[PDB]
Ligand binder design. Structure first.
Ligand SMILES: CCCCCCCCCCCC(=O)OC[C@H](COP(=O)(O)OCC[N+](C)(C)C)OC(=O)CCCCCCCCCCC
Lengths: 119, 64
């Protein structure tokens, strides 16, 4: 689901567990203490392992980075040092040029274009 | 069917079940558990060997 998550060898039918001093059910109400009496091996692929979904290291290649040519919140999701998913967050410099040009003449709208690319 | 069964298969099944119940608790994966017994056994070297019978008496007491 959202917060946590939960074969080759034959499924082997074994029933009628017995010891030398009785049956499995005779000492069932006492064997939880006995760690050597458990019937759920930990190598089984179907063994119930319930582990929380701890999110991966998501460094922010954020606005305050010299590599950034502006203000870019580059949300990088990385495991180890490889790159899994990248979601750039543009808009930290949305001055709304397209909205302002609609209210200014064709001569007055020219200086807006020099401010698109600084170079 | 009386004392010779208490001093026999029926009586010895109780004693074996009692002792084997205590033992099966000891076998459990724990580094701290196995560490103390190793350190505890170092007391055998320290004690004068005239005191082995007392440790044997004490060890039986802890079984209970
Ligand atoms: C010095 C004189 C020597 C004489 C011979 C030795 C004594 C006879 C013992 C026979 C027991 C038997 O046969 O074990 C059979 C018994 C129980 O029987 P069960 O099948 O579980 O039936 C009972 C079923 N209940 C209980 C579920 C109702 O199992 C045991 O307790 C296993 C441990 C046996 C310990 C043997 C120690 C021997 C020490 C001998 C030196 C003192």
């Amino acid at each position: 689901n959202d917060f946590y998550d939960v074969n080759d060898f034959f499924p082997v039918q074994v029933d009628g567990i017995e010891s030398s001093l009785g049956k499995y059910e005779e000492f069932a109400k006492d064997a939880h203490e006995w760690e050597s009496w458990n019937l759920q091996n930990e190598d089984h692929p179907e063994y119930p392992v319930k582990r929380t979904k701890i999110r991966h290291f998501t460094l922010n290649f954020g606005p305050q980075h010299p590599a950034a040519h502006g203000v870019l919140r580059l949300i990088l999701e990385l495991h180890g040092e490889e790159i899994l998913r990248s979601d750039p967050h543009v808009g930290l410099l949305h001055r709304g040029t397209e909205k302002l040009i609609e209210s200014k003449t064709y001569m007055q709208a020219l200086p807006y274009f020099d401010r698109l690319d600084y170079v | 069917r009386g004392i010779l069964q208490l001093f026999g298969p029926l009586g010895l099944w109780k004693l074996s079940t009692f002792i084997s119940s205590k033992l099966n608790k000891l076998v459990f994966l724990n580094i701290g558990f196995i560490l103390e017994i190793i350190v505890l056994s170092w007391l055998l070297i320290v004690f004068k060997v005239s005191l082995l019978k007392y440790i044997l008496l004490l060890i039986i007491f802890i079984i209970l």
